[PDB]
């Protein structure tokens, strides 16, 4: 009947969004996923999945449109990714990847009449085959979120269509999970919101997204800054360059996934 703790809700509206709303929303989202300090070569690490108790596990994110229809996205605090959403009176969850998440997800919107888990998961790789379009060709900006939100909401009432429902999670994930993971991808999105542009991510956005767990291991294993071996990254035009060091990435990456552990901390 009622229940084992409420999760933080952070709000954003695309209604009169500016570079300010957007920034203020992503720093509130960065702030609720990291409990301040497991800070490793200046970059924060997000909570380990192992003794993290269900009531500390998610964050809820309300997204509302000009024309007052809203969606509630659930983010997993341990890797900042979208696990599912609620619109109306029904809730949709992506297909979990394991038994422990299958059951953290039963805690999530337990007060909704109707609850469905997709046969499919939320990784970009399955979701691009559903949308019919690679991330490289799907446009980002404020207009794409206004639209993403109406589409995740009419999926409830049956206004449906999978190509379009998977199109809109690709956009909600990058405009939120990914702008929060990287200071770089939040600047790409506010450049689109300042100037009223909608555009697809270029190749520096896409490799950064694909590399967020490789950079996280690389940085946790660094011999106090130096990467055990170089990571190849990409420029907006497609070129490949390597990073040998954490330095150059402190302005670029905001949050890291936990891959391994300290012994003292030296950070006080």
Q: How was this one solved?
A: X-ray
Residue 214 sits in the same domain as residue 84 = no
Domain that includes residue 240, residue range: 181-268
CATH number, position 201: 4.10.470.10
Query: Per the annotation, where are the binding residues for a carbohydrate?
Result: 9-11, 16, 51, 142-147, 196-198
C-alpha to C-alpha distance for 238 and 10, rounded to whole angstroms:
35
Cα–Cα distance list, 64 to 27, 70, 224 (Å) = 18, 4, 43
The resolution in Å comes to 2.3
- The verdict on 30 and 141 lying in the same domain is yes
The domain boundary, picked from 180, 208, 236, lies at 180
Are both 66 and 191 inside the same structural domain?
no
**Do 117 and 47 belong to one domain?**
yes
Establish whether 103 is a catalytic residue. no
The answer on 239 and 222 residing in a single domain is yes
85 annotated active-site: no
- Do residues 58 and 172 both lie within one domain? yes
Whether 186 is a known active-site residue: answer: no
SS (H, E, C) the chain: CCCCCCCCEEEEECCCCCHHHHHHHHHHHHHHHCCCCCEECCEEECCCCCCCCHHHCEEEEEEECCCCCEEEEEEECCCCCEEEEEECCEEEECCCCCHHHHHHHHHCCCCCCCEEECCCCCCHHHHHHHHCCCHHHCCECHHHHHHHHHHHHHHHCCCCCHHHHHHHHHHHHHHHHHHHHEHHHHHHHHHHHHHCCCECCCHHHHHHHHHHHHHHHHHHCCECCEEEEEEEEECCCCCEEEEEECHHHCCCECCECCCCCCCCCCCC
**Residue list for the binding site:** 9-11, 16, 51, 81-82, 122-124, 142-147, 196-198
Annotated active-site residue in 178, 186, 188, 209: 178
Q: Is 124 a catalytic residue?
A: yes
Closest by Cα among 152, 181, 192, 190 to 169: 152
CA torsion sign for 139, 19, 236, 224 is negative
One domain, residues 131 and 190: no
One of 22, 85, 92, 124 is an active-site residue; which one?
124
Please say which residue of 180, 205, 240 terminates a domain. 180
Q: Are 49 and 260 in contact (CB under 8 A)?
A: no
Whether residue 140 sits in one domain with residue 157: yes
Q: Which residues does 258 contact at the CB level (< 8 Å), separation at least 6? A: 38, 45, 46, 47, 48, 49, 78, 220
Judge if 197 and 266 occupy the same domain.
yes
**Inter-residue contact 89 to 115 (CB < 8 Å):** no
- Identify whether residues 149 and 164 lie together within a single domain: yes
Alpha carbon distance 114, 209 (integer Å): 33
Same domain, yes or no, for 96 and 172? Answer: yes
Choosing from 86, 135, 181, 190, which is the catalytic residue?
181
The CATH number for 36's domain is 3.40.420.10
């Amino acid at each position: 009947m009622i229940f084992p703790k409420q999760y933080p809700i952070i709000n954003f509206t695309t209604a009169g969004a500016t570079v300010q709303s957007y920034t203020n929303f992503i720093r509130a989202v960065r702030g609720r996923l990291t409990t301040g300090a497991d800070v490793r070569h200046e970059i924060p690490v997000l909570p380990n999945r192992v003794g993290l108790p269900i009531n500390q596990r998610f964050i809820l994110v309300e997204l509302s449109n000009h024309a007052e229809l809203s969606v509630t996205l659930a983010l997993d605090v341990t890797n900042a990714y979208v696990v599912g959403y609620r619109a109306g009176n029904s809730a949709y969850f992506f297909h979990p990847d394991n038994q422990e998440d299958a059951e953290a997800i039963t805690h999530l919107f337990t007060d909704v009449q109707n609850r469905y888990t997709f046969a499919f998961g939320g990784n970009y790789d399955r979701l691009e085959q559903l949308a019919g379009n690679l991330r490289e060709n799907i446009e980002l900006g404020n207009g794409p979120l206004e639209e993403a939100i109406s589409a995740l909401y009419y999926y409830s009432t049956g206004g449906t269509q999978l190509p379009t429902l998977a199109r809109s999670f690709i956009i909600c994930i990058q405009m939120i999970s990914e702008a929060a993971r990287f200071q770089y991808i939040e600047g790409e999105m506010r450049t689109r919101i300042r100037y009223n542009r909608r555009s697809a991510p270029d190749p520096s956005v896409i490799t950064l997204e694909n590399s967020w767990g490789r950079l996280s291991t690389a940085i946790q294993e660094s011999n106090q800054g130096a990467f055990a071996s170089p990571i190849q990254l990409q420029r907006r035009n497609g070129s490949k360059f390597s990073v040998y060091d954490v330095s150059i990435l402190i302005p670029i990456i905001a949050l890291m996934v936990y891959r391994c552990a300290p012994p003292p901390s030296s950070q006080f």
